[PDB]
Amino acid sequence: SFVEMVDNLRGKSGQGYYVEMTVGSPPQTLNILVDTGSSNFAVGAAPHPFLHRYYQRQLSSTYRDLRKGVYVPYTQGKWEGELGTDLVSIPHGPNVTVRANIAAITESDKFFINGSNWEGILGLAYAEIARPDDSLEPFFDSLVKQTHVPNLFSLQLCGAGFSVGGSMIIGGIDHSLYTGSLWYTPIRREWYYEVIIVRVEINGQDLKMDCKEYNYDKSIVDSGTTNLRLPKKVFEAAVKSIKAASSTEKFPDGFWLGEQLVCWQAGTTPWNIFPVISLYLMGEVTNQSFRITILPQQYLRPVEDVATSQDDCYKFAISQSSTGTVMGAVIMEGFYVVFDRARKRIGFAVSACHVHDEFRTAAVEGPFVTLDMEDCGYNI
Numbered sequence: 059s060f061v062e063m064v065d066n067l068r069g070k071s072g073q074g075y076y077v078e079m080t081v082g083s084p085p086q087t088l089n090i091l092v093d094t095g096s097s098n099f100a101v102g103a104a105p106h107p108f109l110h111r112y113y114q115r116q117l118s119s120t121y122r123d124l125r126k127g128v129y130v131p132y133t134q135g136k137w138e139g140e141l142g143t144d145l146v147s148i149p150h151g152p153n154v155t156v157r158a159n160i161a162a163i164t165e166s167d168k169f170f171i172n173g174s175n176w177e178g179i180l181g182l183a184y185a186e187i188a189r190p191d192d193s194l195e196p197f198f199d200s201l202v203k204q205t206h207v208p209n210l211f212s213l214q215l216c217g218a219g220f221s222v223g224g225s226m227i228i229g230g231i232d233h234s235l236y237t238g239s240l241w242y243t244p245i246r247r248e249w250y251y252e253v254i255i256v257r258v259e260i261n262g263q264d265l266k267m268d269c270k271e272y273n274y275d276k277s278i279v280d281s282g283t284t285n286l287r288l289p290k291k292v293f294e295a296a297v298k299s300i301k302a303a304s305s306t307e308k309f310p311d312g313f314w315l316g317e318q319l320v321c322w323q324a325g326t327t328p329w330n331i332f333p334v335i336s337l338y339l340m341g342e343v344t345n346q347s348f349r350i351t352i353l354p355q356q357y358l359r360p361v362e363d364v365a366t367s368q369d370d371c372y373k374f375a376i377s378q379s380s381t382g383t384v385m386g387a388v389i390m391e392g393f394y395v396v397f398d399r400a401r402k403r404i405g406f407a408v409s410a411c412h413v414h415d416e417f418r419t420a421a422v423e424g425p426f427v428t429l430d431m432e433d434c435g436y437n438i
């Protein structure tokens with residue numbers, strides 16, 4: 059049932075949201091990062107300084123070695139391992155067990171995160187971007203093929219400001235997790251969860267770029283990336299606008315590069331001097347769109363380091379990209395996001411843990427209409 063799946067996620071945007079899974083027979087329990095931005099299921103399978111536990115293949119009587127190796131480089135971080143198959147379950151997900159491909163990670167570089175409390179990654183996107191190639195069936199494809207679970211899942215990621223980290227509902231939509239309307243944008247191509255941004259405003263001001271620039275060379279929805287990542291041209295305009303709005307305050311060298319912290323005395327963060335970002339997503343009807351609005355409570359990411367805890371400190375959670383737009387975890391937070399694979403669309407609604415203060419709130423609003431008939435997609 060959906061209610062049994064509520065609050066089955068832990069973690070945070072900075073180190074990742076994870077769900078409990080089991081692999082092997084008898085079941086070995088591992089925490090697994092939920093990643094809509096890739097398509098490999100992989101688990102630590104040998105000792106590593108940052109691993110609290112790992113998958114022990116020799117103790118699973120249902121493990122089968124595929125006798126093939128695999129290497130996966132992400133935007134940052136990489137791992138290598140041996141491919142196999144084994145039985146997999148999600149204790150607080152659907153009440154099923156399936157046989158799935160699993161990469162046993164034996165070497166890695168800047169992949170595992172110290173103190174993150176996860177030991178593997180669940181790539182929920184499509185086969186086209188699976189490694190070594192699209193012939194390696196992703197987990198969710200196996201789940202749907204082997205069970206009666208409907209072909210969709212939804213994510214409610216919740217920030218620290220608004221333990222439980224959120225919900226992954228597999229097989230359906232849980233109405234108790236959102237309010238207002240659910241607005242859908244088409245999945246442009248089934249590889250990443252690729253979508254199209256048709257307009258960007260910062261504090262109500264249109265960036266007035268050719269909309270193809272917003273999607274150079276693709277835009278994706280990616281729970282495994284912390285930040286909003288923007289193409290160079292768009293990033294520069296966004297930073298310029300946010301700087302101009304917040305110009306009553308002077309920020310450190312390196313803050314805007316996402317590297318350096320800014321801190322305020324407890325409770326005094328000047329949210330009001332930072333603008334809202336509106337991303338308008340292509341709608342299901344020609345030249346209609348809807349917008350999701352992003353508050354600074356989202357794109358200024360709090361750090362929870364004990365050493366800095368006397369004050370409220372943040373990193374700038376918007377980064378320059380050379381591989382297209384990424385709507386990462388800080389964007390997904392506060393929204394209920396429905397990955398409707400069956401109907402090739404992604405839905406957004408205001409979530410029960412939505413971000414707001416007394417003056418402003420994250421929102422999903424529509425429809426908007428545009429006169430220009432240009433296809434905002436970068437590729438056909």
Ligand SMILES: CCCN1CCC[C@@]12CCN([C@@H](C)C(=O)N[C@@H](Cc1ccccc1)[C@H](O)CNCc1cccc(C(C)C)c1)C2=O
Pocket residue numbers: 071072073074075091093095096097130131132133134135136168169170187188280281282283284285
């Ligand atoms: C949980 C967030 C941890 N955070 C905190 C530190 C920065 C990082 C780690 C790497 N990363 C991004 C830049 C990333 O590459 N994510 C990976 C997942 C990941 C990597 C390393 C550690 C944890 C999570 C994601 O999958 C990218 N999708 C597009 C993408 C880009 C390039 C190649 C691919 C293929 C694998 C299909 C996908 C982050 O945001």
